[PDB]
Design a binder for this molecule. Structure first.
Ligand SMILES: *[C@@H]1O[C@H](CO[C@H]2O[C@@H](C)[C@@H](O)[C@@H](O)[C@@H]2O)[C@@H](O[C@@H]2O[C@H](CO)[C@@H](O[C@@H]3O[C@H](CO[C@@H]4O[C@H](CO)[C@@H](O)[C@H](O)[C@@H]4O)[C@@H](O)[C@H](O[C@@H]4O[C@H](CO)[C@@H](O)[C@H](O)[C@@H]4O)[C@@H]3O)[C@H](O)[C@H]2NC(C)=O)[C@H](O[C@@H]2O[C@@H](C)[C@@H](O)[C@@H](O)[C@@H]2O)[C@H]1NC(C)=O
Ligand SMILES: *[C@@H]1O[C@H](CO[C@@H]2O[C@@H](C)[C@@H](O)[C@@H](O)[C@@H]2O)[C@@H](O[C@@H]2O[C@H](CO)[C@@H](O[C@@H]3O[C@H](CO)[C@@H](O)[C@H](O)[C@@H]3O)[C@H](O)[C@H]2NC(C)=O)[C@H](O[C@@H]2O[C@@H](C)[C@@H](O)[C@@H](O)[C@@H]2O)[C@H]1NC(C)=O
Lengths: 166, 170
């Protein structure tokens, strides 16, 4: 099976995810952050999961934060809302871009002008078969319930955010 | 010194870098690929370089390919052309976005319809001083320099981005 895949993460102005934010996304307490993550692939049995998302004052995602949004696929922040996924098909190379979309309502946890939203994405299998990967599990099913995904099958992305300090 | 920084890589339609390209970028022989790579940061003394870029039939950037277009900052492919960089400054949170822009001409040397463009970005220092990073060097300077240790890392895991390409083929 073809498990070649690339991932992307982008912030958007609204929950129609029509227009990507230029240049650095500004946020304030009780404004929404709109997050689109995607995998581009050429195998229908191949899916992905948003393993973890969290914010911190550090671009390096190895640094610890207690501002967790998603953890082990389950939403940990109470404001996280999912939108429908969107699959864009490129039938000539039989490729598709599979997009997952969510938002959260920004909380005043930190006090730095710039913050970083870090999301870790991992590949999974949509169908018990010749694809060697954990089965895709929905966010709701994660919460009502933890295998190691190999480095080429996962990626962390980090987007910057600007905040006006009070 | 603040060496916090995030990177982006985006493909575009022309040398104007106006319209981002769809999720899979179509290529063909003798046609252009326009690439913009950016850093967002909060230190005027911090810069970045495009260390290496190559194309291959594998999404895994560990698998090397003989189709290398930039190596150790120097353009190895004669088609590579750099354009005016853009620098946007945001005074409220004291941040800046610096964009580097380049193009190459695709050559079709694989026999797969889906390819991947891999670029590795590294941080550098614009001024000798507090950043424990190598000095920034321009692509042309990197091509002419006989300084073997100009370029170094202390990182052991550094920043790579990969963009999918479809080779139109027919
Ligand atoms: C990521 O993608 C690459 C490219 O895959 C493409 O090609 C196939 C698989 C199809 O999915 C395409 O739509 C993709 O775009 C994977 O590498 C490829 O792996 C396949 C086997 O899984 C292997 O298959 C042989 O292909 C021969 C063609 O020769 C070359 O093709 C490449 C590919 O673009 C060119 O650049 C070359 O110039 C040259 O054309 C076929 O002749 C051969 O024929 C069949 O053999 C089978 C098996 O015996 C038999 O049943 C049939 O009847 C035929 O006789 C094979 O099918 C490709 O050669 C290989 N391509 C390259 C460029 O390496 C890659 O898979 C990973 O790496 C390869 C080397 C294997 O180790 C895979 O097991 C491994 O997964 C894939 N990566 C991942 C992680 O999925
Ligand atoms: C990445 O960002 C953080 C910068 O934090 C602040 O916000 C940004 C927007 C910018 O305005 C910076 O000017 C601000 O500092 C860094 O974390 C901060 O680091 C500073 C020290 O550089 C620390 O503040 C001071 O530390 C001095 C030491 O003289 C101490 O006497 C004071 O107590 C004073 O607080 C901040 O508290 C710290 N902020 C947080 C939220 O942790 C971060 O730098 C790195 O990690 C910190 C903890 C220190 O170890 C730094 O040495 C280390 O670089 C920045 N990361 C990088 C890679 O630059």
């Amino acid at each position: 099976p073809n498990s070649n895949a690339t991932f992307n993460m982008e912030l958007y102005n609204t929950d129609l995810f029509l227009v990507p934010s230029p240049g650095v996304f500004s946020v304030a307490e009780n404004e929404h952050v709109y997050v689109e993550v995607s995998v581009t692939k050429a195998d229908q049995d191949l899916g992905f999961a948003i393993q973890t998302c969290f914010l911190s004052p550090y671009s390096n995602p190895d640094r610890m934060s207690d501002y967790t949004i998603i953890e082990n696929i389950c939403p940990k922040d109470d404001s996280v809302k999912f939108y429908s996924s969107k699959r864009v098909h490129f039938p000539i190379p039989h490729a598709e871009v599979d997009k997952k979309r969510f938002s959260f309502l920004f909380k005043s946890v930190f006090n730095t002008s710039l913050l970083f939203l870090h999301c870790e994405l991992t590949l999974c299998s949509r169908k018990k078969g010749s694809l060697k990967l954990p089965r895709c599990v929905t966010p709701d099913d994660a919460c009502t319930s933890m295998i190691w995904t190999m480095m080429q099958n996962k990626k962390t992305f980090t987007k910057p955010l600007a905040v006006v300090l009070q």
